[PDB]
Amino acid sequence: FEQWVTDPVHIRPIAHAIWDPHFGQPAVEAFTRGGASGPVNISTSGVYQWWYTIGMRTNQDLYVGSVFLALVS
Amino acid sequence: DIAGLTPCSESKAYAKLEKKELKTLEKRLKQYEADSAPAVALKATMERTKARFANYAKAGLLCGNDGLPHLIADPGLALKYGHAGEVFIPTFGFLYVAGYIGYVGRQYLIAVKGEAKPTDKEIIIDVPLATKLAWQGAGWPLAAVQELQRGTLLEKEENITVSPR
Amino acid sequence: GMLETPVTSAPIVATYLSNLPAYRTGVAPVLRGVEIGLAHGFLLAGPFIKLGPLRNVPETAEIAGSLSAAGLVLILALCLSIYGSAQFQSARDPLFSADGWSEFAAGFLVGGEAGVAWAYVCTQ
Amino acid sequence: WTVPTLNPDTPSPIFGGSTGGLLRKAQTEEFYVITWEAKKEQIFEMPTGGAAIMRQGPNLLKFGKKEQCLALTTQLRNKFKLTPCFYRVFPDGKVQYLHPADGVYPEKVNAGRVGANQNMRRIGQNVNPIKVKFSGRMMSPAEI
Amino acid sequence: MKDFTTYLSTAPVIATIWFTFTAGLLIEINRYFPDPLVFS
Amino acid sequence: AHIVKIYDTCIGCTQCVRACPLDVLEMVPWDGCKASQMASAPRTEDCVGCKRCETACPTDFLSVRVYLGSESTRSMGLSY
Amino acid sequence: AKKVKIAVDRNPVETSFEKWAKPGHFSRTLSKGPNTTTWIWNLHADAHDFDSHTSDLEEISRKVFSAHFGQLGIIFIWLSGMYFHGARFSNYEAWLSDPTHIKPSAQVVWPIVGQEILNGDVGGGFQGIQITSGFFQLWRASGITSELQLYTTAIGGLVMAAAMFFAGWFHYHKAAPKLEWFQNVESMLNHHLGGLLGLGSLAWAGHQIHVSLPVNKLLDAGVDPKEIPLPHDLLLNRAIMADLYPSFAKGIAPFFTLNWSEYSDFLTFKGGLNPVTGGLWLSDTAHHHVAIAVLFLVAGHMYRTNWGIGHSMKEILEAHRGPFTGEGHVGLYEILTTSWHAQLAINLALFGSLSIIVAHHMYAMPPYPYLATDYGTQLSLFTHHTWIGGFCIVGAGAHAAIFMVRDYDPTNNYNNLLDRVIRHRDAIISHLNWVCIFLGFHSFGLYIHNDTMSALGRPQDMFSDTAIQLQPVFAQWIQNTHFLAPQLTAPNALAATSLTWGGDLVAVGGKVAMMPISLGTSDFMVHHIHAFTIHVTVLILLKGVLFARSSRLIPDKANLGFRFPCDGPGRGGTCQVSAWDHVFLGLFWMYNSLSIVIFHFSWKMQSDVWGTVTASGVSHITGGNFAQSANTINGWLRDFLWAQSSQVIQSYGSALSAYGLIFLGAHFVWAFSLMFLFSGRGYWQELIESIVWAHNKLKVAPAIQPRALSITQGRAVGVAHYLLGGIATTWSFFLARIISVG
Numbered sequence A: 001f002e003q004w005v006t007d008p009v010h011i012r013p014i015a016h017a018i019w020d021p022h023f024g025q026p027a028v029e030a031f032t033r034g035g036a037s038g039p040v041n042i043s044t045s046g047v048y049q050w051w052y053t054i055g056m057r058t059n060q061d062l063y064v065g066s067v068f069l070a071l072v073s
Numbered sequence B: 001d002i003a004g005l006t007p008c009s010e011s012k013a014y015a016k017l018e019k020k021e022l023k024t025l026e027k028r029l030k031q032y033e034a035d036s037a038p039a040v041a042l043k044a045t046m047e048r049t050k051a052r053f054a055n056y057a058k059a060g061l062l063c064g065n066d067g068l069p070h071l072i073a074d075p076g077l078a079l080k081y082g083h084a085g086e087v088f089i090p091t092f093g094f095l096y097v098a099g100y101i102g103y104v105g106r107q108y109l110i111a112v113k114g115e116a117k118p119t120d121k122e123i124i125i126d127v128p129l130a131t132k133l134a135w136q137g138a139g140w141p142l143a144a145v146q147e148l149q150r151g152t153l154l155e156k157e158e159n160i161t162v163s164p165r
Numbered sequence C: 001g002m003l004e005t006p007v008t009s010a011p012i013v014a015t016y017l018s019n020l021p022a023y024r025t026g027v028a029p030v031l032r033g034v035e036i037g038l039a040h041g042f043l044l045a046g047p048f049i050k051l052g053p054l055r056n057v058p059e060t061a062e063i064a065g066s067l068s069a070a071g072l073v074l075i076l077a078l079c080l081s082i083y084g085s086a087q088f089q090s091a092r093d094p095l096f097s098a099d100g101w102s103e104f105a106a107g108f109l110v111g112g113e114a115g116v117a118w119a120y121v122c123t124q
Numbered sequence D: 001w002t003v004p005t006l007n008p009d010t011p012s013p014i015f016g017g018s019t020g021g022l023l024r025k026a027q028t029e030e031f032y033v034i035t036w037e038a039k040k041e042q043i044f045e046m047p048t049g050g051a052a053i054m055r056q057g058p059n060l061l062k063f064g065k066k067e068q069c070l071a072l073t074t075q076l077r078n079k080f081k082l083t084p085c086f087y088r089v090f091p092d093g094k095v096q097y098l099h100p101a102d103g104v105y106p107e108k109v110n111a112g113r114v115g116a117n118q119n120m121r122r123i124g125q126n127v128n129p130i131k132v133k134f135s136g137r138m139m140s141p142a143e144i
Numbered sequence E: 001m002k003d004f005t006t007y008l009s010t011a012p013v014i015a016t017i018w019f020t021f022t023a024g025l026l027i028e029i030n031r032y033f034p035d036p037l038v039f040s
Numbered sequence F: 001a002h003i004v005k006i007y008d009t010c011i012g013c014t015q016c017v018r019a020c021p022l023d024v025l026e027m028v029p030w031d032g033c034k035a036s037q038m039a040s041a042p043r044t045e046d047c048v049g050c051k052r053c054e055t056a057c058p059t060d061f062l063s064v065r066v067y068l069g070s071e072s073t074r075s076m077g078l079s080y
Numbered sequence G: 001a002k003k004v005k006i007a008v009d010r011n012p013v014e015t016s017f018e019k020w021a022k023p024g025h026f027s028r029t030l031s032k033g034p035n036t037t038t039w040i041w042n043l044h045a046d047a048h049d050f051d052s053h054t055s056d057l058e059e060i061s062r063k064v065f066s067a068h069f070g071q072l073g074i075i076f077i078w079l080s081g082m083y084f085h086g087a088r089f090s091n092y093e094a095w096l097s098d099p100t101h102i103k104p105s106a107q108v109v110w111p112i113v114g115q116e117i118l119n120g121d122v123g124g125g126f127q128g129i130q131i132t133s134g135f136f137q138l139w140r141a142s143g144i145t146s147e148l149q150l151y152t153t154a155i156g157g158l159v160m161a162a163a164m165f166f167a168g169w170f171h172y173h174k175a176a177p178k179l180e181w182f183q184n185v186e187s188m189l190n191h192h193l194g195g196l197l198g199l200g201s202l203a204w205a206g207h208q209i210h211v212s213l214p215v216n217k218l219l220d221a222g223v224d225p226k227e228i229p230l231p232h233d234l235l236l237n238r239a240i241m242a243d244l245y246p247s248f249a250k251g252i253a254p255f256f257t258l259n260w261s262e263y264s265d266f267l268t269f270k271g272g273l274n275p276v277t278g279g280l281w282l283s284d285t286a287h288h289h290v291a292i293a294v295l296f297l298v299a300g301h302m303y304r305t306n307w308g309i310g311h312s313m314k315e316i317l318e319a320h321r322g323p324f325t326g327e328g329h330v331g332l333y334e335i336l337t338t339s340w341h342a343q344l345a346i347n348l349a350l351f352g353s354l355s356i357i358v359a360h361h362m363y364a365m366p367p368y369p370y371l372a373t374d375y376g377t378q379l380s381l382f383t384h385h386t387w388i389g390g391f392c393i394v395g396a397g398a399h400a401a402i403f404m405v406r407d408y409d410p411t412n413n414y415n416n417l418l419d420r421v422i423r424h425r426d427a428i429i430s431h432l433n434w435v436c437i438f439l440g441f442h443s444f445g446l447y448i449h450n451d452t453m454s455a456l457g458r459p460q461d462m463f464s465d466t467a468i469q470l471q472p473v474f475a476q477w478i479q480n481t482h483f484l485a486p487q488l489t490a491p492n493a494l495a496a497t498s499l500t501w502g503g504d505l506v507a508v509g510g511k512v513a514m515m516p517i518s519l520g521t522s523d524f525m526v527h528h529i530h531a532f533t534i535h536v537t538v539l540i541l542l543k544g545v546l547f548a549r550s551s552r553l554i555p556d557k558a559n560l561g562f563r564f565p566c567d568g569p570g571r572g573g574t575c576q577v578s579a580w581d582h583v584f585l586g587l588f589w590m591y592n593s594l595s596i597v598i599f600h601f602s603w604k605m606q607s608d609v610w611g612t613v614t615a616s617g618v619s620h621i622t623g624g625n626f627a628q629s630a631n632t633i634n635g636w637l638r639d640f641l642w643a644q645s646s647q648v649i650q651s652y653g654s655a656l657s658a659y660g661l662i663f664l665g666a667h668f669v670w671a672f673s674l675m676f677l678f679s680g681r682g683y684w685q686e687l688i689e690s691i692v693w694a695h696n697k698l699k700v701a702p703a704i705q706p707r708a709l710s711i712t713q714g715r716a717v718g719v720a721h722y723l724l725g726g727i728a729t730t731w732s733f734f735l736a737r738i739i740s741v742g
């Protein structure tokens, strides 16, 4: 998110990381992208654009929201 | 013109389309003889193609950016700009035939309900009666309206079976 | 009655089955569990080692395959245990009872893991 | 008429056997026995599949469910004109008799029978489902 | 002959003749007036 | 067990009793029809829900009705 | 000792149109006329169910015999049309001169509504639809060289068609054979073995020896067709025949003096394919039909009719009695002489299996000239005769169950082979059930294993030739054995029967006619798919036959009949228990299994056999991608269905544009069928009630009460549309593809 907010036009958002022991090495390399540590999925739900529009700018902004909603749950 | 369309007679894409179709036919032509059977058939096709493109332009149709005729359905726009023959006039052409067929069938169905065995008059058609009703259907719009005003077109609500409610 | 057939009713077949651990009555359920577990556990290592994802590694193939065979025996032991819980909640053989089956499942785990370990020792 | 008593030693038809016979249910829950008298030896069709020869005199068969017994009863009655009767037998040894419940086949009206599950109304006079709601269980308007 | 003409009056026979006639009329019209798109 | 109900439009044709493949129904005396007999359902615990009885009833609407209910070994028609 | 003799009845029935005007006359139920629309469907459904109209076997047999004359008369009209259209609307004469460059065509369309574009450029100064029926190759092999010869056959075909319809009328209304006549099975086999097959083979050998061989010998030499001697000149002038085949100079003396080796020049045993035309040697084909003629003529003298010598079929059956099978084949003779359905069940089973065998042998041993290099004809003929065989086999199950319900009588069957089979049906179905589950996992699971390993980037873990291997060692051994047969086991054969076993390819006109076919891991996997889908089809059909009369669910299923929808929602639900429904389900699986068979054939041939021969070597249509790609489901989707459907979807604006339209239309009919399969008539009867109300409101309600289709007709309508749409979709896809590239 923090990298995407800088250049949203030319960066693919990341949904979450992949830990699949069944993967082969070509699969691990194939899904590594976006400057991530390892394989990741690209987000398609638009939460990046939504959260960026409503004022979120850093990962700590998302962390506080996550704990707040877990408490509300 | 209407909705940004242009007359096909003035459309550049429309003219180019005719050349493409004729060019395709001409390409096949040059592999035959002058007056062989295949050559004559191909020449006949080209004549119809040229006639078709002249007729549509002469009819004053509208062509889009695709260079293909488009039809106008609004009665006001059709009568305003002389496109009544695309949809509006054919609308009343179909309904006359559709009502003709339906009215003739309804007359025959009522006619045989009076017979002793109506079911056998449906699988085995009473051709003399059907031909008689076929000709009298030409005036169905007049007969149809008069039934409506006299109240004999519809059954009574009390004579129609319905499910529990 | 039922359709008689040599396979269903033959002398040679009947004697062979009567000597199997499952049908050999008079033996404690735990001991039968160990005897059955050892046989299956020993065989279970074969396919994992030869056709596993790490089969082409020189030395890791033996360890990885056997370690996966041990895991499957553990899962099977759970299946045996819960089956006894569901089936026996309230007859001639002690095995088909709540007390007998629980001992049987425990023996299978001990025998099965021993068989997997014994299979590994054969390789190295 | 008095309730017949089953004779377990009754001879059974000449049948080789099949795989369509009794299962473990017969040993744990129940099974059914059908008996009848045969005028002459004849071939009939087993509801479980195959053909069997009925001995002259008493015959006895065992089936896995009631419908199988009453399927054979229809054959014997309609085609060979016999009069069979069958029971329900439990693993504990108890024997329950039925069909004919009172000795007369149900198709024929007999005095002494008491009407059961008879509603003195038409189907169209049942109440609406809303009026039998929250009655403790799913209840149709026909039940009340 | 009365029965034979009765057979020709059966529904399948009438439909075959009727649609054969109807189809022929439409085919012939398009043979002499090819490519009709607008009443004109 | 299924629920089987006999309604007062029965004409005592006996066709439902003949059709039933499990001897669930029987005929009993009655005074509400010309035949002076009515169908009865004393053994519904053996009913399987085939609805052969409803197929055989001449009256309109049916005079015998089957409402499928709780399942069991007998009503599910199992031999195992 | 009832003598075998002709027995008929005079004027059994009167020829009148009275009953033509009374629909339903044949059945008591439908004779009263219609009250609901259900009557109309019942009229057509039961029209040919003779066994249910009357209980008299003699009356049933007479209708069957004449209904067969009507079928023969229809085939002659169809055959006459094919020969006539070849004479008048084909480019056959031009094709004879340049067979390798001119596409066969025998259908021409009229110039209306712009459909004349379907008259494509096929060659020979001719415009028409290209045909894949292979009639041009058949006519060339027989020696037809002019449209006059085609025209005369068509006229003869119509005369035969008229004779067939006269025979049907004569043998039903004038002189109808009696029941005792129909039951001479020994006599019928004698005439049909030695008379129909035997003399038919000998007569055709006469045509080949005297017409086909001389004409095709000159055609292959390059002689202009118009300059070849006419067939009657070859027959009348032994001098001409001697020039082509010197053996004719000796007449028929060698035949009667047993010097049969004199005829070695035109009665050969070469084997292989003719290099000039790419088809089987006609001299080999003539010796085949001469040998077959003698074998069948001997076969026709086996059964005893009127003169003591011979076999009694009843005695043979009753003598074959073993320890494991109780009574044995006792009672089968009475079953097979009193049940038409039992006879039909056997004949459909083997006739269908024969049609499938024809498909395999004709492609591997192309019997006609220029058949092999015409890839459209090869693909069409193999696919056509596989579908015919598939439907016939499913019918065999249908009519085996009809026998079991209607014609089966326990009194005649006690402890015989038939009875004992019924008494362990649970053992049979339970074992066949397990085999299908085993075959489904270990054949289709391998494809799922490969697809997952490939998607995970683990190609080394796949089942393939470059990975874990599954070689058809048994099939490969047989291919090598047949390749070396001429050396030791068939010394007098010059070449192997087919070029599929091995050796060198034969190329005609720059295209491969046939070459060795290699079997690898992909072939191993696909073959075990065939075994899986065939075994499942047997399970469904065999289950229906064995449980037609009763089961543990419906103990009295026979009384319900052969074709009923259910026995109600009781016992949990009994939908589709009747034996008719096992045919209904069996049709889907037969369609599923044969679709893979014709996809296997189409991809394997294009990838490994068909192609263009050039200086460097053979380049195949799909470039040998079968071996590496057909081991995953994704490979079939991408490389076969997606890539090869390019031709059909780009057909608009060309002569093949018709296949594009039918490709879409077939997709439509298939999806339309799911409406009938996924729904039930309860919804539709209520829908019609509201529709009928509108008609009642307008005094236009019909006298024949509308009814939703029955439960069974919904299933029949569903499967018929499902099959038509699915099969027509492949039909368009195959022809537009192979015609475009092949």
Ligand code: CLA
Residues within 6 Å of the ligand: B074, B075, B076, B077, B080
């Ligand atoms: C199916 C519905 C429908 C719709 C969406 C339209 C839409 C249109 N019609 Mg059409 N029309 C229809 C049915 C419809 N019509 C029918 C059934 C008839 C009778 C056979 C007509 C007869 C008709 C005429 C005579 C005229 C239009 C015109 C129009 C345009 C503007 C006025 C209008 O109708 O506003 C929206 C439509 C409706 C609310 C439905 C009723 C419309 C009535 C029947 C016509 C109204 C004409 C209007 C008073 C003209 C004022 C001058 C105009 C330049 C502003 C518009 C494109 C006018 C035009 O050519 O404009 C360029 C015009 O002169 N229509």
Ligand code: CLA
Residues within 6 Å of the ligand: G013, G014, G015, G016, G017, G019, G020, G026, G062, G063, G064, G066, G067, G069, G070, G165, G166, G167, G168, G169, G172, G173
């Ligand atoms: C003109 C001559 C003639 C006449 C008047 C009759 C009259 C009679 N026949 Mg006879 N019959 C004839 C010729 C004739 N037959 C011939 C040529 C044959 C040999 C096939 C037979 C074989 C025959 C049999 C086996 C039977 C009769 C029967 C009958 C009776 C009823 C027939 C009926 O309802 O037909 C009406 C039926 C039709 C009009 C259907 C015609 C079917 C033909 C074969 C055409 C098939 C076309 C095919 C489906 C095309 C493909 C369709 C696709 C394109 C959609 C009646 C006494 C029946 C009888 O006596 O029952 C008690 C009976 O069982 N006939």
Ligand code: CLA
Residues within 6 Å of the ligand: G202, G203, G205, G206, G207, G209, G210, G234, G235, G236, G237, G238, G241, G247, G248, G250, G251, G252, G255, G263, G290
């Ligand atoms: C059924 C198949 C068949 C038929 C019909 C023929 C027919 C013929 N073959 Mg062939 N042939 C066949 C199979 C056949 N062959 C096979 C399988 C082989 C391989 C072994 C051969 C090998 C072969 C050879 C090597 C030769 C022939 C030859 C012939 C011709 C002369 C035979 C001869 O001398 O007959 C002798 C006599 C008869 C057959 C009897 C004729 C009886 C007549 C028809 C009776 C008419 C009676 C009547 C009342 C009179 C009319 C009265 C009326 C006008 C009023 C003849 C056209 C010869 C030939 O000429 O080849 C070009 C020849 O050399 N064939």
Ligand code: CLA
Residues within 6 Å of the ligand: G044, G045, G046, G047, G048, G049, G050, G348, G391, G392, G393, G394, G395, G396, G398, G399, G402, G563, G580, G583, G720
């Ligand atoms: C030699 C072949 C043969 C023969 C002589 C018969 C004969 C018979 N079969 Mg059998 N059958 C066969 C093959 C054969 N079958 C095959 C191959 C199958 C597998 C599909 C079956 C499956 C089968 C079933 C499931 C049943 C029969 C039944 C019957 C009996 C009545 C048939 C009837 O009334 O049809 C009347 C004919 C029709 C209603 C016409 C059907 C039209 C089809 C569905 C059209 C399909 C599309 C078309 C071919 C192409 C497109 C058309 C175009 C207009 C779009 C009769 C004894 C029935 C019976 O009761 O037997 C005791 C029965 O239930 N057969």
Ligand code: CLA
Residues within 6 Å of the ligand: G433, G434, G436, G437, G438, G439, G440, G441, G444, G445, G448, G536, G539, G540, G585, G588, G589
């Ligand atoms: C793609 C669709 C599809 C599939 C997968 C199946 C599957 C099956 N059908 Mg069915 N069927 C279908 C469509 C399908 N059918 C349709 C459309 C119809 C209507 C005409 C029918 C009608 C029908 C009938 C009438 C019959 C079958 C039968 C069968 C079975 C064949 C034997 C077997 O067990 O194979 C093995 C099973 C498979 C190949 C399924 C896929 C297995 C995967 C690839 C591997 C296992 C997964 C693995 C354990 C991982 C799971 C992880 C997860 C738990 C987290 C099987 C269960 C026959 C049967 O029951 O035979 C015993 C049978 O009689 N089908």
Ligand SMILES: CC1=C(C/C=C(\C)CCC[C@H](C)CCC[C@H](C)CCCC(C)C)C(=O)c2ccccc2C1=O
Residues within 6 Å of the ligand: E015, G675, G676, G677, G679, G680, G681, G684, G707, G708, G709, G710, G711, G713, G714, G715
């Ligand atoms: C659509 C559908 C229907 C409704 C379909 C019906 C009633 C068939 C309609 C057939 C035709 C279209 C109606 C009869 C047409 C007449 C012959 C008149 C035609 C006159 C000219 C136009 C030719 C069922 O009845 C049904 C039953 C069981 C399972 C599924 C379904 C199902 O899916």
